[PDB]
């Protein structure tokens, strides 16, 4: 098991190897319960090119045991053709020669920051998780969420907001995800509350 | 592992084992996101009796990574008895000696033909796929699905149909899957579009 | 793999190992297909500390390949909080050492008397499960379910309840799951019929 224990996860910058992912700091990822490093929660991820839609996880994320990203936007699948079976794929048939590529990217899929994702909690191609959400464990993200909602359930539906609309756009407004740590570990005192408000008078004072 | 990437899956044909898992030609699974060969994808699956309920698997189907098919109907479980516990079963026990056997067969799963499969679905006993249908991951069929229906969700829905009543009705008429490979190479440059009336055509044509 | 076949699970007193976790008799756990033994079933469960949720199984329970039990409270994190980034846990890192522990507990996880609970179902901290209930593959609870409730779903759902509120009523009140076995084995052939009402009779009798 690349984990030595379920209670201690480890950082992404220190086991992410595939090119195509993007972590930011802090962020980790603790799966002792499916003994893989983070790289294989990217499914389908070629390290390979760079013509190929990335996972990009932002900065101070805790992802939890499972997590997984179904990459390679549609696997040259096509709902909308005649026939699902990706014949151009089957090289080694050759009436499927002039079978044409239907592979289609889908994009990035972003994680925003501060996002805590339930252990084996599974997200689309494409999808965009805003900034402090939280994904409910199990939860099948099928498409965006919104910044401080909670969503959950397959398909992933918004429980509710973490905060105020008014607090939520005070928190997108001082991004303390990239607050020098200096700073981080001044307001540590008012990270550990609920007091938005408080936190951000806190801020535009020091600002000063 | 007994896949070496996750961009390239093996064929039904090649891997099957059970003798109660009766599969199609072209049909494919790829699982290195699971490690194990399709055989351990049927569940439960007795491949020494002849009198249980088999896993069909029609032709030109795509079976995604770690999709799984729970047999042995109820598994001996009754929920309208009074004890929901196998009884029968724990034989090592004496005082549950007279134990009546509550298994009861559910019928053979069946898959039609041109099925994609998400990677992690998961069938009840008994369901029935039809033809074209498309099973989002994760999603857990409780239920027959209808032919050209996609579904998805814990329980699976129907969120759509892939085309047109009509289309959808000329497409079963014409059987492409059961068309020799010859026709199909023929049909090849129609089959990667969505003109289900243009191939139409071409197949009436031909069958002349 | 810890078990020999998908066919025959093994006993929860056999091969539970936490401290932690208190099953009750008969009660099995088939995980063939998941190869583990129970106890790492009980996820984030420390079998080294007195002072957390304990995961009670209780007697005649079925548990299917894979179940999941949520434990560890909260985790660490506070979805209330400005951030749900467990600083306090980061030991490692300086600036993040005033922070607070957030932690807390969510109380015993308590599973009643034959509840068969479906391949892979996993349930959230502090769900309490009532007697008899039937827990659906794959169901995801999120909170206490009623006796002889059958639940299905990511959210689970009661999809319906085994027998009649008399009928259970009666259920509860004899609670054949604390009978002396020799009285098991006598109403045995009762316990293999839906008729609750001839087994209440059989019971109120022998009682005499
Ligand atoms: C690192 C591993 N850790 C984890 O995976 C734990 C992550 N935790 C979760 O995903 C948690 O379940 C949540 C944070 C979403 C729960 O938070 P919270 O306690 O506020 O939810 P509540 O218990 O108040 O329930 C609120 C609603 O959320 C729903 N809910 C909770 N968790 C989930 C989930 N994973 N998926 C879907 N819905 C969910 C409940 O069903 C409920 O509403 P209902 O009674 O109308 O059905
Ligand atoms: C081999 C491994 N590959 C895979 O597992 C990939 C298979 N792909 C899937 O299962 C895909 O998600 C689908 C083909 C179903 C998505 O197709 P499509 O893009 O047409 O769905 P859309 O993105 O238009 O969304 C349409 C609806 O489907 C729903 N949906 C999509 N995927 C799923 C799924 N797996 N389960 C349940 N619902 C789903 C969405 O929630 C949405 O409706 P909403 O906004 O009202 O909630
Ligand atoms: C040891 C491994 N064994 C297992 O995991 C098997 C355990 N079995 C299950 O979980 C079974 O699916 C159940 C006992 C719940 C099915 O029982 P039953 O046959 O009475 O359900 P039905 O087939 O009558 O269907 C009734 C409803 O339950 C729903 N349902 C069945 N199984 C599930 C499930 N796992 N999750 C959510 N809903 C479910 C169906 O969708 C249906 O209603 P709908 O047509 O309105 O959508
Ligand atoms: O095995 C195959 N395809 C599967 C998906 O059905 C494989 O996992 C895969 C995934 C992505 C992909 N791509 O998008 O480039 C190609 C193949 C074809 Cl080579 Cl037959
Ligand atoms: O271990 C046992 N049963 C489980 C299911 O609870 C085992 O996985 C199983 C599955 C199917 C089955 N059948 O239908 O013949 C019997 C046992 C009994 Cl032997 Cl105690
Ligand atoms: O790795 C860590 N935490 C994860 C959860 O994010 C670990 O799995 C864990 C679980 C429970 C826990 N607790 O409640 O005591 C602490 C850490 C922190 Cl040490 Cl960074």
């Given at each position: 098991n690349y984990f030595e224990s379920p209670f201690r996860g480890k950082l992404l910058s220190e086991q992410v190897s595939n090119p195509n992912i993007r972590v930011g700091r802090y962020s980790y990822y603790s799966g002792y319960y499916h003994g893989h490093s983070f790289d294989d929660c990217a499914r389908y991820l070629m390290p390979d090119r760079d013509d190929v839609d990335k996972l990009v996880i932002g900065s101070f994320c805790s992802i939890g045991s499972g997590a997984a990203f179904i990459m390679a936007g549609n696997q040259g699948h096509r709902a909308e053709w005649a026939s699902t079976f990706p014949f151009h794929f089957m090289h080694?048939?050759?009436?499927?020669?002039?079978?044409?590529?239907?592979?289609?990217?889908?994009?990035?899929?972003?994680?925003?920051?501060?996002?805590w994702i339930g252990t084996e909690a599974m997200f689309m191609p494409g999808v965009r998780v805003g900034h402090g959400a939280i994904i409910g464990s199990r939860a099948l993200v099928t498409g965006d969420v919104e910044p401080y909602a909670i969503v959950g359930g397959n398909p992933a539906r918004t429980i509710r907001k973490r905060?105020?609309?008014?607090?939520?756009?005070?928190?997108?407004?001082?991004?303390?995800?990239?607050?020098?740590?200096?700073?981080?570990?001044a307001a540590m005192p008012l990270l550990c509350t609920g007091d938005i408000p408080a936190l951000y008078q806190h801020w535009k004072q020091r600002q000063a």
């Open positions: 080694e048939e050759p009436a499927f020669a002039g079978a044409v590529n239907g592979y289609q990217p889908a994009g990035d899929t972003l994680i925003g920051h501060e996002v905060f105020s609309d008014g607090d939520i756009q005070n928190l997108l407004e001082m991004a303390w995800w990239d607050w020098p740590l200096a700073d981080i570990e």
